Curated annotation (Swiss-Prot), chains A, B:
Catalyses which reaction(s): alpha-D-galactose + ATP = alpha-D-galactose 1-phosphate + ADP + H(+)
Connected disease: Galactosemia 2: A form of galactosemia, an inborn error of galactose metabolism typically manifesting in the neonatal period, after ingestion of galactose, with jaundice, hepatosplenomegaly, hepatocellular insufficiency, food intolerance, hypoglycemia, renal tubular dysfunction, muscle hypotonia, sepsis and cataract. GALAC2 inheritance is autosomal recessive.
Modified positions (Phosphoserine) in chain numbering: S229
Entry's Gene Ontology cellular component terms: cytoplasm; cytosol; extracellular exosome; membrane
Protein name (database record): Galactokinase
Organism (species): Homo sapiens (Human)
Disulfide bonds: none
Family: Belongs to the GHMP kinase family. GalK subfamily.
Domain of life: Eukaryota
Residues at the site labelled Transition state stabilizer: R36
Effect of P27T: In GALAC2; founder Romani mutation
One of the record's GO molecular function terms: ATP binding
Residue ranges crossing the lipid bilayer per the database entry: none
């Protein structure tokens, strides 16, 4: 036991049956959207940098039907969601716009509806099921937004691009969820392809598909199953810290600041500010190197870069915690572990570990043994992004 | 005027309609797969080179229904498909494979059925309609193959990779149409994204999606209305002349040969084979430079590299015709045109012209006046790849 990862046909069946019960008929329409692990390139997306995430086999499925009455009627089967697990509300009009409210889980859906670029949208009934753990740092939020977006497309086709949909999901997260994320989670949930990671250039929005499918390789995800109080909190503080440092250096973003320019201008910025820029500018470089390493088959080089990334996030960006540090220190101790680090926004959530497929069983036993807390594990391949399911 | 480009809703309705008439019921399943234009990197894909295609709004729509009796029943509405435009034939069995026969157009479907990797596959009825001009160098052939494959996936899920679907369609084109194509046409049909070009590395099969986000940049396609059939052309001879040069220099392919190496090895190959290989080696270098130019907005550079592509295809590879030559010279005389070149296999078909959007109307009048024949015109955006359409 690593945690089981239901396949789509299973999640679809569970969603259909829960809808049949709730609404009294079979649903007409279905879609899926994955969760996400970031292999490397943390706190770079809102700095116009480089990220290398892959989509997981963990996913949100959303089934539903149009209505003729202009209503939205929702049910989520996730415990983890704040109560009530059901909500109904009328579609926004040019006269009354939707509003963030409680239950907080519905905000993600209301936000996507509120910014959906096409019209006219009918009402709908829908059930959500998820295998993404809510609030585990594997991006259940972007899964839900992108599932919601893809579903609305089945009611009312858009005329825009992948990146425009990601930006609609991003704005919904900003205005309705109150969380000023970059573009990474929405982008990988939309753009994943199985047996690949995605080098996303968050400035050009150019994407490269980097093969990550060798039977002698595994990616292991360790849920710390913790979430400290600085999550809601220091993420916006860091994002503001980065924008200052860029202004002080005459730079549109930290993407335009070369690592050698930064060293030779510490005196223009706080000692705290300097350590933040150093992380971001180095991580961008590490992410470019790591992508080339992963294509080459150089797991050792990739693993070193993962660890260098962890040290940087721990000491220079200070978004690690004791629990993530502990879980990374246990992982590197295991023979066959190429590297390990804190993934997502941090202050808790998950570590990602790259290792020999043969060592995963040992690696899971050693990390459980050497972690105070109760840890959960996913052995996860690179998955496809958001799909329509024909019913 | 640009020739208008039917949207999917309209191709779908012409397909529902011809399906109802032919088979006396509504179809249950639908798919689309686009044609493509190659921006630069011609006759490199089978030499393990680089190409930069985008998918088109021109597409093949296939609608159909599982059958009970283990037969395949097909209709196409394309004028230009050899008679008969309808046929039935039994599914391949373990006892006996499909074989290429008459009519030539159905070899593309038979081949994809023969090589489709998942079982069991039921009989089916299907109609094919297309906005892709048959024989025009916009890959009507790969559009047909990939539409068929995406359809079979609706009858019987596969569980390989996007890449293995393209190599099935390629396999079908080699063995059933006897046309030894590279992987480009099938890959772009599968992998397209609207508002992107696709840089394909045909050695490693790595892909980048390059944003075409600029409303002041147009792509104009000019059909010469001289038809190629690539099978019976000098295409297989070019491919073999490239192979004999690689073999002579001890290279796995011409991707492994630099210009300077080819130049010192003249005494190893014929005058002709040297010229063919010099086009290929040159064209690989130019496609990398072109991607770099496009990435920084240097359209004048991109256009000069396209003109060099065209002179290399005309003089060293010898796959142009007097008609493509006149269409290119005529587009180059127009202000706001960055570059123009033949696209696809050659011997006829289409040119591709990159130009200021505002110049498109002048450019269409000028090329038509200065063309000895009758040109048709598509003003083209980057389009989505192959898709399921839920009925
Ligand atoms: N399937 C779901 N059903 C209901 N709410 C969900 C679902 N998936 C995500 N959510 C919402 O998203 C929140 C988790 O997002 P967040 O705190 O950003 O963590 P993460 O994105 O890492 O999982 C939940 O608290 C809930 O409000
Ligand atoms: N929709 C269609 N219906 C029937 N045949 C088709 C269709 N699309 C493509 N074809 C077949 O593909 C052939 C064209 O292939 P080819 O000569 O390689 O040209 P292209 O560059 O258009 O792909 C036609 O001769 C016909 O056999
Ligand atoms: O890599 C840091 C990461 O953090 C969170 O997961 C956000 O959702 C992303 O947008 C990104 O900033
Ligand atoms: O670039 C030339 C081009 O010609 C045809 O369209 C083939 O299908 C492609 O594979 C490629 O070889
Ligand atoms: Mg989140
Ligand atoms: Mg063809
Ligand atoms: Na433990
Ligand atoms: Na003319």
């Amino acid at each position: 036991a690593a945690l089981r990862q239901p396949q789509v046909a299973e999640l679809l069946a569970e969603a259909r049956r829960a809808f049949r019960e709730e609404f009294g008929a079979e649903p007409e329409l279905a879609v899926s959207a994955p969760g996400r692990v970031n292999l490397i390139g943390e706190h770079t997306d809102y700095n116009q940098g480089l990220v290398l995430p892959m989509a997981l086999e963990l996913m949100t499925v959303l089934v539903g039907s149009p209505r003729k009455d202009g209503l939205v009627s929702l049910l989520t089967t996730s415990e983890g969601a704040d109560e009530p697990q059901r909500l109904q509300f009328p579609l926004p009009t040019a006269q009354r716009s939707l509003e963030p409210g409680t239950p907080r889980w519905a905000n993600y859906v209301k936000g996507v509806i509120q910014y959906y670029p096409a019209a006219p949208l009918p009402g709908f009934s829908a059930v959500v099921v998820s295998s993404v753990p809510l609030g585990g740092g594997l991006s259940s939020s972007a899964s839900l937004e992108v599932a919601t977006y893809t579903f609305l497309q089945q009611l009312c086709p858009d005329s825009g691009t992948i990146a425009a949909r990601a930006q609609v999901c991003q704005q919904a997260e900003h205005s309705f969820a109150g969380m000023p994320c970059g573009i990474m989670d929405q982008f990988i949930s939309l753009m994943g392809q199985k047996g690949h990671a995605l080098l996303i250039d968050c400035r050009s929005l150019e994407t490269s598909l980097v093969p990550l499918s060798d039977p002698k390789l595994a990616v292991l995800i360790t849920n710390s199953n913790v979430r400290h109080s600085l999550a809601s909190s220091e993420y916006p503080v860091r994002r503001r810290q980065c924008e200052e440092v860029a202004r002080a250096l005459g730079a549109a973003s930290l993407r335009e600041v070369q690592l050698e320019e930064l060293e030779a201008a510490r005196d223009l910025v706080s000692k705290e500010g300097f350590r933040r820029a150093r992380h971001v500018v180095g991580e961008i470089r590490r992410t470019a190197q790591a992508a080339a390493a992963l294509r080459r088959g150089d797991y050792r080089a990739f693993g070193r870069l993962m660890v260098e990334s962890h040290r940087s996030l721990r000491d220079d960006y200070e978004v690690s915690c004791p629990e993530l540090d502990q879980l990374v220190e246990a992982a590197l101790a295991v023979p066959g572990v190429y590297g390990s680090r804190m993934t997502g926004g941090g202050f808790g959530g998950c570590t990602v570990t790259l290792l020999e497929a043969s060592a995963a069983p040992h690696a899971m036993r050693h990390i459980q043994e050497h972690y105070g807390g109760t840890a959960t594990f996913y052995l996860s391949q690179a998955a496809d992004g958001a799909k329509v399911l024909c019913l």
